[PDB]
Design a protein around this ligand. Structure first.
Ligand SMILES: [Zn+2]
Ligand SMILES: [Zn+2]
Ligand SMILES: [Zn+2]
Lengths: 408, 408, 408
């Protein structure tokens, strides 16, 4: 009955096909749990048992739980995750008409693995910006249905397929969405127009621009003979968003708690401007920050039994082995002996197994940070694999971290 | 309401994860339509309005519809397709235990594209041979559940991923099915033992050998903005089996009709031995054969708009453009001007659009044959794409071919 | 020491330098055992207890042991093996005279390893066809004596020898047989005439053509500290013929048994044409074959300790660990779950150890078949290696199979 955390992750993933949808999903959960939306344009009146959230660009979210003592005296407990994932995005003048098809040109967002996007039943979702009633508006759309596919070329016509080839993103990625009669005109913006109507019944004067991503229509799922795994797109990093949320809503204590889920992690001012607004002027920010810690959550690489030499022999985390503390001496404000020690101890105290990762050696707010993540395979594929046990481990330790009244 | 042929193809695909399952599915349909199973070990007593089928190795099937005139006088109308597909098969001593996992070693069956098998939710099915009650038996098993996955290595640990690499089948294909405690023993045959019990409640003395294939648990489906496509594994060549069956069961007339669906097309005596048993001794076979024609059905390559130069400019068949007559002057008993002309005319007469294919030029019973197929993309992927209109076109023309009382 | 027991195998190899001699040796044993030679030119009358054999081109052989019940009722038990091996054959106009030598030009028959043929004491044998007393005649000859050598080049004149070089079969394989005075004429046909007279007391008017193979005069031998191995030329595949013959002569029971030893396995009508003559016309043949099984015996590869990575870690057969069941899903009428299962149980039941092989994944009559072989090293060398216990294991199982009244 971490069956429930896992079911919740699956539903969150299905409701979050783009960073915008992930943000709106997080906002629903928070609104249902009593968090008040603050608007950055307004002056804020916050207080000591207060429960708040704020968004920017409708794609980034910070949730705030103010406790009994002020951040000056007790610091903030912060958990960081991200709302974006590497994917394929529709270009601005996208219509491609060849060999009787309609295709949409795509931009590669983040460091996607290309090959797995092929031969998948894809749909399309995101923000559309348009003019209605002489004013500018945006809405989210999700076609939902499998409207697109990027087919492989038959091995018969590419006989060295398995020997590998540099996949050209410009040429081989544009998905097929339909057939066109000769020579029907193709207007993608008209299709968005229809979709706005069908989904929200709005009648746009003109559709201006959009940020739309393809995504797999096949749901995340528990896989394995004995259900040891979860497979799904966007585990990087919606897995961590979900954990951080579950921990935030359920944590005990009365500490000052922050969940930051930022867009564009795959491509700082937001967090800073928000935290400063919760404190007096002067030395209070710097002083509260020096009593704070950030648990920066972002999936780690499990050691893959078919590519085991890609890991250091002594640092191969296992799926269902718990969260992984990520060490890289070549970063500032990364894991250090103090932030790692704190976090490792926190796991021991909660009886949550915990692991370590560094790489093979041949391969700003100023807050103390520990970098952790759940171990996974196939990072940046359209379908990643995590352990089915690990989400409950992370939720527990993050709960203890938010309830934790003393920091190092 | 070719919506119905397409729904039927989807269900046939779901019920046919291996050539054995495809064969048992075809046999159910035939048995329900009144066809009698003949057994090759017995003497046969066949007759003029008779409806029969026969199987070999439980993986190949021939269905026979004898008409009013004998094959000596009117020939046979034969349609050929295949029950197998390229896939991954479990090796005989398969258990691999590394980094805390259980994996099963795999053999590559046919010319599979490797990359698409990665990051898919896979299950396992096939024949298991065993000893129960002092006698040798076989049964089909299908675990059904997604018990296995072949994960990609993260792009972070293989940064040139997209530039391509020769995928090593021995090393990179073995699927993960479970986690093992150190050092639980792993017995795959015990797992088959449990599965026999769970699925058929049989208690084997010993499990001897098996022929088991992994397969995608994600169902075939209609995809496209306007439903122009079907995506699914095993379209090569269960698409043609289904068409040939639907045509056989529904065709008018009273001609001698044969559907041959053979195993191992991907890796002759069967068909021959069967046909000879339907005729007297002497010159009757050779004479009936010279009045017969075989429509050998096997998917063709549509021209792919992202790889259009892989086709000859003048011979790019289109999805939903109808069946494709396949010309290759470098084969004997392949399409020729007579068998092609016949078939093209048959399409014209039935108002079924029809197309032609040859390749770019830089790339035995003795029966007259025409080679046709529906156009598709991604042949030998784990998920292929066909047109949603084409199955109805093929079923109609094949119906007319079986009802057709004069051959060239 | 002892023990050995492989003496039968050694003597059979010694007597069988070519496929013709292999056939004559099998024929003489069969005759002495009371098997009657059928001539394919004549009408045949066979009877329920009958013992027969038949040859073709004097180089293939089929032995037949008819049992109590007809093949229609009880099937055939067939064992298949082959009479040929890779070797060097003399060309039709072979005399090469250079630097004072007579050499004979050779052609490479089969996939021979070239290097082992060097620096060996070779003799020559096979079929000579000639004309005497106005009739066409053929006889076998065997010079016996070491009359030929293919010497290496001194390392001093080829200092990078051990780095390897592509051996050119046309220039480096021709064997040296003698020295020629200036400018003595060489006539190879005259030498054959002498050898025909010596061996058969016959004088040819003219020697026309021949099929002659070089072979090693060094007898097969048991080798190793505890006599673990047998070293000899032509273990592929005379090892299987011998085991097949031993099993056929000594088998108990009253089943229909076939032994098929064919020429040209090193790259099906004979067998079918013969089996059809053992049956009535009509459906009998096909019904008898659907009750039959073929054990197709051809040496397998043991995992070699100096080149272990050429095998799958899990499917490395051991010399002296018994018969190997060879699995390759990429064939029709090859080992399958039923034919493997049957054979495996038969081994367990005869207390014969049994093994499985598939390769690394990165490397007719329509009878059910199981492909098996004894494990060996150095296949296709002039001197191969097998295990000295493995013959008995094979003979015991083939015997149980020939006795085995209950087939699948
Ligand atoms: Zn990422
Ligand atoms: Zn195919
Ligand atoms: Zn060989």
């Amino acid at each position: 009955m971490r069956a429930e955390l896992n079911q919740g992750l699956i539903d969150f993933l299905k409701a979050s096909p783009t960073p915008f949808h992930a943000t709106a999903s997080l906002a629903r959960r928070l609104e249902a749990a009593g968090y008040r939306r603050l608007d950055e344009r307004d002056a804020w009146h916050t207080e000591t048992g207060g429960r708040y959230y704020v968004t920017r660009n409708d794609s980034s979210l910070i949730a705030i739980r103010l406790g009994r003592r002020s951040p000056l005296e007790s610091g903030f407990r912060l958990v960081g995750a991200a709302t974006d994932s590497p994917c394929l995005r529709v270009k601005p003048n996208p219509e491609i008409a060849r060999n009787g098809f309609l295709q949409l040109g795509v931009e590669v967002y983040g460091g996607a693995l290309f090959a797995p996007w092929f031969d998948r039943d894809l749909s399309l979702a995101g923000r559309v910006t348009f003019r209605a009633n002489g004013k500018l508006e945006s809405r989210l759309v999700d076609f939902r249905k499998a409207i697109a596919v990027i087919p492989n070329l038959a091995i018969h016509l590419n006989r060295a397929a398995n020997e590998g080839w540099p996949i050209n993103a410009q040429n081989e990625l544009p998905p097929i969405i339909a057939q066109l009669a000769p020579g029907e005109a193709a207007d993608f913006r008209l299709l968005l127009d229809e979709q706005l109507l069908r989904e929200h019944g709005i009648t746009a004067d003109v559709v201006l621009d959009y940020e739309l991503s393809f995504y797999d229509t096949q749901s995340a799922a528990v896989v394995g003979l004995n259900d040891e795994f979860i497979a799904g797109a966007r585990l990087d990093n919606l897995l961590s968003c979900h954990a951080g949320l579950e921990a935030l809503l359920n944590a005990e204590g009365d500490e000052n708690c922050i969940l930051v889920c930022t867009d564009h992690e795959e491509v700082g001012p937001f967090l800073e401007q928000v935290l400063r607004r919760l404190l007096p002027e002067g030395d209070a920010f710097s002083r509260a920050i020096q009593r704070s810690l950030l648990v920066s959550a972002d999936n780690a690489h499990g050691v893959h039994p078919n590519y085991a030499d890609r890991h250091d022999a002594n640092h191969g985390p296992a799926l269902n082995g718990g969260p992984v503390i990520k060490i890289n001496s070549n970063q500032r404000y990364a894991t250090n002996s103090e932030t790692a020690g704190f976090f490792r101890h926190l796991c021991q105290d909660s009886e949550v197994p915990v692991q370590s990762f560094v790489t093979r050696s041949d391969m700003q707010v100023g807050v103390r940070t520990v970098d952790i993540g759940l171990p996974t395979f196939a990072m940046h594929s359209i379908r990643e694999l995590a352990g089915s046990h690990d989400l409950a481990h992370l939720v527990k330790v993050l709960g203890a971290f938010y309830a934790s009244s003393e920091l190092p």
